Write a protein that binds this ligand. Structure first.
Ligand code: BES
Ligand code: ZN
Length: 867
């Protein structure tokens, strides 16, 4: 297995390549690549040029057209010795796109040929300096059969084109912007193309082109609209304009991730492009908006300024995720977006930070870089950027962005460079703050308060600590922006002050323990703590149920109201899981049910907020409330809680469900909010009197005039195991079996079903007409959903879930390591479960560990999980 690489070993390259001219003689079985690079030595004169290469058939090596004899091929490299200070390197090699099942480098997607080069896929195309601090100007000539590949695309603009004998043709592209090879892209195939235009604020007219498989034009307008929305927003919010003449996006069916920001030629998983009202849900529309925007935002945060090395991945991913969240939030509901992102942080990222794979947002050790496009690097990375925004304020934050681009435009930078730019532009000291980049694990912030009537002072005693993680035995206090707000008994905000001077609501929690005193607090306050999730930490405060219901009705920020409800539910989710383990039924105080009844009947509350408060935490969110996870107890308690609320709020739920009916379907935020609330109510109504529920659900499925409402009904039928379930599921299959993206929703429902025979059903679906092990989307929607989204079934006491996953991973380890690595994650969490389960999970991991040709992707995770 390959050795681990460490951030502290970074060293500038001995050679730089300033320009590269590529020529591809394209063919699915045998592609011939000719690469002419202009190299310049920067290191010692006796240093050899070390080129990275994987699975390449070397044809020849020339230096200034002279056949070179001073070279040697070694594991993953071509080492060239005795070179001039400046020279022209010419490499000719062959590759086989059709044989590329890992989908890394140049591969085949259906009948099209396309690429994926990040993190290190370009080395699978030709021998090169496959490191992001080497920026070269690319020129790409593509030669191919005209009938099979009428469209030949690469980064930049077309500078040449011609016809050849034997029905072949070629096109040459030039991208003026120097770039690391991970941003290189090539696409060849036959597509339908949606063309539009966007005029920047300064007048630059940009040609927009969206390439989709023939017959998919009816699902392309929303993505195009989202691209234009993204371009406009970046101008308005960040003052950034697109910098090229054309913007191409190609939607492909076979892609390991969601999308890729290749300069001027983004390549997208079709899941994040294709949408029409009968195939896509409101969520799909908003996800397409998010991803289209995300990759577009990389044009500046990632492309114009790239990464010095891969340990600096968060420099572009954390910042770009922050940007896509601000984009979504500005255009839609900021409260809903913040709530959703906090659910991801608390329910998924915290779990990772408490797992064997824990790492700082800026990793120190990496074996397989593809294993580091994580919730930590992305989501926590964004939370760190957001904390900088919280500490600086929008104005100074933008000044920091401006200085960052001024200093690093056209180069590869580091996380430290970014922080320095923010510090220098704002004059805000971020020296202590920097620890957020080096320390893994989730900080735990404990708060104790006291109200002194004699002095009319409110005191907060705040403590912090980060438990040790398997990767770091030493932990230190962080600079935690801790936002608060105090309310009097009328729900009015109490001015924060001390010694006659106002105090900022964002407290600087920088020590292991500290006190914060506020005077002129005339009456005992109810505090709102860690407002808007001001820092990615776990809050420990002894809330009374009344303080929480008070906040649910009076908190100024909608997020606080949702957050208070989560704290209220946590107490009873924990209470009932303990009861479940002792064979006792659900117990819930009347005043708790009343709090949710109040939310339903509050006419002043935003439907968007009400919908989220009425959406119970997922089983994965619930799992984080426990030291030792009991997946079956959690799943059954979640259903029991749903049933109890459905019974206690039956009339109110139906009233709100009916009140939010909308005849017209619009992908507009106000409409989406009402529909989300209506369907939130439907989830509960599905657990009402069987016949009543069955009729209501089947009715919505059949009368729905959009996929959002149809899927909501189908999901409810499956969740409540209603009589109509089998009929509706078969009807969906018969109508959509030919559409993979649509069937993925169906596979997810089958995989996350509460039915006793779910595994048997999932295994059988491996033979379904709409499923195929060759497609990452299908794999993740069926197998991934089962293992990661149905922990109750995956963790069946008999161990059947683990055995099934081992079978699937034995296949995927050889076929597609990246997808295999995404799928093994559930097994890596073994220490969070009981002894019996740990034993079975360890056995499963040991079996995988002994696999012939074990991929580095899995090796890295298996090793840490078995430690
Ligand atoms: C909206 C985005 C956060 C979705 C996300 N895509 C990205 O982050 C891209 O900008 C990544 N740069 C693409 C990528 C992902 C994984 C490994 C190598 C390369 C993805 O999941 O593909
Ligand atoms: Zn990204």
């Amino acid at each position: 297995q390959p050795q681990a690489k460490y951030r502290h070993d970074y060293r500038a390259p001995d050679y730089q390549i300033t320009d590269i001219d590529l020529t591809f003689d394209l063919d699915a079985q045998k592609t011939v690549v000719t690469a002419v690079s202009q190299a310049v030595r920067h290191g010692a004169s006796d240093a050899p040029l070390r080129l990275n290469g994987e699975d390449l058939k070397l044809v020849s090596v020339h230096i200034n057209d002279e056949p070179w004899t001073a070279w040697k091929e070694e594991e993953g490299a071509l080492v060239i010795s005795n070179l001039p200070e400046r020279f022209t390197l010419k490499i000719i090699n062959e590759i086989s796109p059709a044989a590329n099942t890992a989908l890394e480098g140049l591969y085949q997607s259906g009948d099209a040929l396309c690429t994926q080069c990040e993190a290190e896929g370009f080395r699978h195309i030709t021998y090169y300096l496959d490191r992001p601090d080497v920026l070269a100007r690319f020129t790409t000539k593509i030669i191919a059969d005209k009938i099979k590949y009428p469209f030949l695309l690469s980064n930049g603009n077309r500078v040449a084109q011609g016809e050849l004998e034997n029905g072949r043709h070629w096109v040459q592209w030039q991208d003026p912007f120097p770039k690391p090879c991970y941003l290189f892209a090539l696409v060849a195939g036959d597509f339908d193309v949606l063309r539009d235009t966007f005029t920047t604020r300064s007048g630059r007219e940009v040609a927009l082109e969206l390439y989709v498989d023939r017959g998919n034009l009816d699902r392309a307008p929303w993505a195009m609209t989202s691209l234009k929305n993204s371009m406009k927003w970046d101008e308005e919010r960040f003052g950034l304009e697109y910098d090229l003449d054309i913007y191409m996006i190609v939607a492909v069916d076979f892609f390991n991730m969601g999308a890729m920001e290749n300069k001027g030629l983004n390549i997208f998983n079709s899941k994040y492009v294709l949408a029409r009202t009968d195939t896509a849900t409101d969520k799909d529309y908003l996800d397409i908006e998010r991803v289209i925007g995300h990759e577009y935002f990389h044009n500046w945060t990632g492309n114009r300024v790239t990464c010095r090395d891969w340990f600096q991945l968060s420099l572009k991913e954390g910042l770009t995720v922050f940007r896509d969240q601000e984009f979504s939030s500005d255009l839609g509901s900021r409260a809903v977006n913040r709530i959703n992102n906090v659910r991801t942080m608390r329910g998924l990222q915290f779990a990772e930070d408490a797992s064997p794979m824990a790492h700082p947002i800026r990793p120190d050790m990496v074996i397989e870089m593809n294993n580091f496009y994580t919730l930590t690097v992305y989501e926590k990375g964004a939370e760190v950027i957001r904390m900088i925004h919280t500490l600086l304020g929008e104005e100074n934050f933008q000044k920091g962005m401006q200085l960052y681009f001024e200093r690093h435009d056209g180069s590869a930078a580091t996380c430290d460079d970014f922080v320095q730019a923010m510090e220098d532009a704002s004059n805000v000291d971020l020296s202590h703050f920097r620890r957020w980049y080096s320390q893994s694990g989730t900080p735990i912030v404990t708060v104790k308060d006291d109200y002194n009537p004699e002095t009319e002072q409110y005191t907060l005693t705040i403590s912090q600590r980060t438990p040790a993680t398997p990767d770091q035995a030493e932990k230190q206090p962080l600079h935690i922006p801790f936002a608060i707000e105090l309310y009097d008994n009328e729900g009015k905000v109490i001015p924060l002050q001390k010694g006659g001077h106002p105090v900022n609501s964002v407290l600087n929690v920088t020590q292991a323990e500290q006190t914060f005193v506020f005077d002129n607090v005339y009456f005992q306050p109810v505090p709102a703590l860690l407002c808007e999730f001001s820092a990615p930490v776990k809050l420990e405060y002894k809330w009374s149920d009344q303080q929480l219901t008070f906040l649910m009705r009076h908190a100024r920020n909608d997020f606080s109201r949702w957050d208070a409800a989560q704290s209220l539910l946590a107490t009873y989710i924990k209470l009932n899981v303990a009861r479940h383990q002792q064979g006792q039924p659900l117990s819930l105080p009347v005043h708790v049910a009343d709090a949710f009844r109040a939310v339903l009947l509050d006419e002043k509350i935003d439907p968007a907020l009400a919908a989220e408060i009425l959406t119970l935490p997922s089983v994965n969110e619930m799992a984080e409330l426990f030291d030792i996870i009991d997946p079956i107890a959690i799943a059954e308690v979640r259903e029991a809680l749903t049933r109890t609320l459905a019974t206690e709020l039956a009339d109110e739920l139906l009233a709100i469900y009916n009140a939010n009916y909308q005849s017209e379907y619009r992908v507009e935020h106000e409409d989406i909010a009402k529909r989300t609330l209506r369907n939130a109510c439907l989830r509960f109504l599905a657990f009402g009197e069987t016949h009543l529920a069955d009729v209501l659900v089947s009715k919505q499925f059949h009368e729905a005039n959009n996929m959002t409402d149809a899927l909501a009904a189908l999901s409810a039928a499956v969740a409540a195991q209603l009589p109509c379930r089998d009929a509706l599921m078969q009807e969906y299959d018969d109508k959509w079996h030919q559409n993979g993206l649509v069937m993925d929703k169906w596979f997810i429902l089958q995989a996350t079903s509460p039915a006793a025979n779910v595994l048997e059903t999932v295994r059988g679906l491996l033979q379904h007409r709409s499923f195929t092990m060759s497609n990452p989307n299908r794999i993740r929607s069926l197998i991934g959903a089962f293992a990661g989204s149905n922990p109750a079934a995956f963790h069946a006491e008999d161990g059947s879930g683990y055995l099934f996953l081992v079978e699937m991973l034995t296949d995927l380890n050889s076929r597609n390591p990246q997808v295999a690595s995404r799928l093994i994650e559930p097994l890596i969490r073994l220490k969070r479960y009981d002894a019996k389960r740990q034993e079975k999970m360890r056995a499963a991991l040991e079996q995988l560990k002994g696999l012939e040709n074990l991929s580095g992707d899995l090796y890295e995770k298996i090793t840490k999980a078995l430690a």
